[PDB]
């Protein structure tokens, strides 16, 4: 122990995404004038996009050749960023970052390719951070090298180009603005996509996207540990939050550099609606490891509730409460998994059998993830996102369980 006491240690972090830009699919984000920021230490306003020359880009605004490699702010994003000072009144020590990228956002591979292209991107970030009085920039490139399985352009040079982009961004911003990233759950991310040891000293912290695991042959979307009763069939699909954290610790990231991402939403597992393939098998597609257990009645049920499960499986927590838990016909039965430490709902099939419909986060499971953050010595939590929460209930539980102090 020290010979003299030290000042009060700063609290754990809670980094909340506010998806004010929205999507073309989901429409614009929420109303920044109604946003309550009392439960967070850092706000990631999302998303800025990247002007790019990828052939498959559909956003015509991003194709301006005069602005290639710069950051694009939609009208809604630019309007909202001008309103940041009004949020600071609720939480004067709040740090606000602009997040650039997101799932399906093109342009990083080209922007990162050369010192010259990186310099254009960085100068754009500097101008935006300065002119809107932000505290820093967050980069959500999904993903260097892998390209989110071909969804965005990618090349092997992305790995070391990403390091260079972050190093040159830190050089330009200095030590008085924040630079952070979101990083994927996939085990291949630290192995092949991102040089975590090289980038960690450049970044204020790293947000782990410890969610979106309800794919392939896996049932749960953000199980803390493996579920004993619902095991994943193909080894490459076997994920848990603890597995992801341990992968990044083994790759050399320190606990104090990582926030644990929490999803304020649920997913219907892809295993319900699409054959799950074990790619290690011969004739893998001919002999699926799992087969869909939803039929037309269950697909139609979700359609009647506003979800086309062939296109997306995402259900906001507020809609889980309103449409599923509070379904007037009480068609969804609630369950708890003792090892995954998350809730899940079943529906009765046409054959009368209970079927695993969706796993998600509730206050109980969020409190458990907060206690795990404390147990593992992590830096705090990150969450996606305010517009999916139900009157900030998950954000409030998270703050209470982490001990975030009040104003």
């Amino acid at each position: 122990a020290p010979t003299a006491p030290v000042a009060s240690a700063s609290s754990l972090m809670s980094v909340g995404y506010f998806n004010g830009g929205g999507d073309v699919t989901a429409g614009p984000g929420g109303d920044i004038n109604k946003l309550d920021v009392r439960q967070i230490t850092h706000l990631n306003y999302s998303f800025g996009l990247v002007y790019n020359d990828e052939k498959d880009e559909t956003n015509a605004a991003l194709k301006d050749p005069a602005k290639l490699h710069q950051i694009w702010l939609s009208p809604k994003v630019a309007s909202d960023l001008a309103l940041i000072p009004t949020l600071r009144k609720q939480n004067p020590n709040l740090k606000v970052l602009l997040s650039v990228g997101g799932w399906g956002a093109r342009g990083f591979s080209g922007a990162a390719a050369t010192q010259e292209s990186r310099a254009v991107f960085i100068r754009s970030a500097q101008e935006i951070v300065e002119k809107y009085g932000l505290d820093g920039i967050d980069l959500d490139w999904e993903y260097p090298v892998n390209g989110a399985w071909g969804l965005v352009a990618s090349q092997p040079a992305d790995r070391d180009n990403f390091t260079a982009l972050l190093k040159e961004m830190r050089d330009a911003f200095g030590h008085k603005k924040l630079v952070t990233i979101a990083i994927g759950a996939n085990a291949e991310s630290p192995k092949s996509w991102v040089d975590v040891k090289a980038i960690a000293p450049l970044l204020d912290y790293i947000n782990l996207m410890t969610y979106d695991m309800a794919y392939g042959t896996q049932y749960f979307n953000a199980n803390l540990y493996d579920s004993s009763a619902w095991p994943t069939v193909a080894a490459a699909d076997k994920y848990s939050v603890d597995f992801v954290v341990n992968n990044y610790l083994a790759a050399g990231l320190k606990p104090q550099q990582m926030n644990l991402g929490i999803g304020f939403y649920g997913r219907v597992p892809k295993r319900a609606v699409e054959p799950g393939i074990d790619w290690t098998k011969p004739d893998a597609q001919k002999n699926p490891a799992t087969q869909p257990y939803f039929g037309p009645q269950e697909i139609g049920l979700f359609k009647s509730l506003g979800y086309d499960l062939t296109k997306d499986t995402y259900v906001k927590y507020n809609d889980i409460v309103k449409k599923l838990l509070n379904d007037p016909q009480k068609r969804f039965t609630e369950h708890w998994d003792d090892q995954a430490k998350v809730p899940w709902l079943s529906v009765k099939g046409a054959d009368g059998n209970a079927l695993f419909a969706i796993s998600y986060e509730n206050p109980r499971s969020v409190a458990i993830k907060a206690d795990y953050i404390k147990e593992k010595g992590l830096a705090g939590a990150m969450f996606w996102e305010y517009g999916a929460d139900d009157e900030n209930q998950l954000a409030k539980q998270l703050a209470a369980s982490l001990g975030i102090p009040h104003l």
Side-chain angles (χ1 to χ4, degrees):
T3 47
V6 292
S8 64
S10 83
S11 73
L12 289 171
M13 279 176 289
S14 183
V15 182
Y17 273 87
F18 177 82
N19 199 39
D23 338 41
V24 302
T25 60
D31 186 351
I32 197 151
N33 304 284
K34 288 342 208 163
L35 177 62
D36 170 17
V37 294
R38 293 172 301 148
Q39 297 96 39
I40 52 163
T41 58
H42 297 68
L43 175 64
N44 281 352
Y45 183 97
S46 66
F47 282 107
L49 300 182
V50 185
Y51 286 95
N52 73 82
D53 60 2
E54 302 187 23
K55 176 182 46 173
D56 287 348
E57 178 60 67
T58 54
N59 187 340
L62 299 185
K63 305 189 179 176
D64 182 356
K67 288 192 71 185
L68 181 62
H69 310 315
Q70 296 182 40
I71 294 160
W72 180 75
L73 308 181
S74 75
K76 171 65 153 61
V77 169
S79 179
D80 285 355
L81 287 186
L83 297 167
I84 294 310
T86 68
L87 297 177
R88 299 192 180 279
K89 295 166 190 133
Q90 303 178 33
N91 187 350
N93 296 318
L94 176 68
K95 303 299 180 243
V96 179
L97 299 89
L98 171 67
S99 289
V100 181
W103 182 73
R106 302 179 175 270
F108 277 115
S109 188
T114 68
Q115 190 285 142
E116 294 71 30
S117 66
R118 293 190 300 264
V120 169
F121 181 93
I122 292 161
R123 283 190 293 266
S124 182
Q126 294 177 275
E127 148 167 5
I128 291 165
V129 165
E130 175 66 16
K131 75 194 179 181
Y132 292 120
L134 307 183
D135 299 295
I137 195 89
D138 174 70
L139 300 191
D140 306 346
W141 178 354
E142 301 176 26
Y143 302 110
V145 182
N146 165 275
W149 289 297
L151 191 57
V152 304
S154 66
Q155 52 179 6
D158 288 347
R159 179 193 182 261
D160 291 352
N161 290 348
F162 189 38
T163 301
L165 177 59
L166 294 177
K167 176 192 174 332
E168 292 158 17
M169 183 84 70
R170 173 59 66 199
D171 283 343
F173 273 111
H175 288 112
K176 309 62 73 183
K177 294 286 159 187
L178 304 171
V179 185
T180 70
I181 70 167
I183 205 166
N186 199 294
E188 202 60 50
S189 167
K191 297 186 48 179
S192 64
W193 309 349
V194 177
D195 187 346
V196 299
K197 288 175 325 273
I199 70 170
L202 309 174
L203 300 172
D204 295 280
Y205 54 82
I206 294 165
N207 295 326
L208 304 183
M209 288 192 287
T210 29
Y211 43 67
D212 287 349
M213 296 161 194
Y215 289 94
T217 61
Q218 172 140 322
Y219 285 99
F220 285 93
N221 198 52
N223 50 302
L224 185 53
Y225 302 98
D226 296 320
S227 166
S228 149
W230 303 94
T232 299
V233 178
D237 300 347
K238 189 166 157 309
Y239 277 81
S240 69
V241 171
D242 181 67
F243 173 65
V244 170
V245 170
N246 291 333
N247 291 341
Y248 277 112
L249 293 170
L253 285 188
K254 295 190 262 273
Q256 53 255 52
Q257 309 189 276
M258 289 185 289
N259 286 320
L260 188 80
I262 303 177
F264 289 173
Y265 61 92
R267 283 195 183 277
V268 173
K270 270 302 177 188
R271 180 172 172 166
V273 295
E274 180 176 316
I277 305 308
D278 180 350
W279 300 106
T280 77
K281 300 290 181 255
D283 266 344
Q285 264 149 318
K286 205 294 154 183
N287 304 104
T290 67
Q291 275 165 86
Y293 56 88
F294 273 11
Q297 183 164 123
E298 294 73 49
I299 293 164
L301 170 62
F302 272 89
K303 168 85 186 115
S304 81
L305 295 170
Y307 304 93
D308 174 350
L309 301 179
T310 73
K311 316 207 226 73
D312 207 2
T313 53
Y314 183 91
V315 187
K316 295 179 197 160
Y317 177 61
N318 55 56
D319 284 324
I320 292 176
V321 173
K322 179 177 74 91
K323 305 184 179 171
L324 310 188
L325 291 175
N326 300 345
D327 179 50
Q329 285 166 283
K330 293 278 106 144
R331 290 173 291 183
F332 297 87
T333 297
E334 193 187 338
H335 305 260
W336 179 260
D337 189 286
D338 288 340
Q339 297 90 222
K341 308 203 181 174
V342 293
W344 62 274
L345 309 183
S346 62
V347 289
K348 289 194 167 89
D351 68 359
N353 286 231
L355 305 172
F356 191 114
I358 177 163
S359 72
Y360 63 104
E361 297 285 344
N362 65 7
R364 185 184 176 191
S365 67
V366 167
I368 288 165
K369 283 185 171 79
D371 278 341
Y372 177 88
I373 285 164
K374 299 201 286 200
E375 187 191 337
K376 296 284 279 182
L378 302 172
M382 165 274 284
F383 62 82
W384 173 276
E385 58 97 16
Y386 277 107
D389 203 352
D390 199 35
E391 304 202 320
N392 276 32
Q393 285 282 43
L394 300 187
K396 286 149 178 189
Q397 182 63 65
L398 181 54
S401 299
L402 289 175
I404 314 289
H406 312 266
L407 178 46

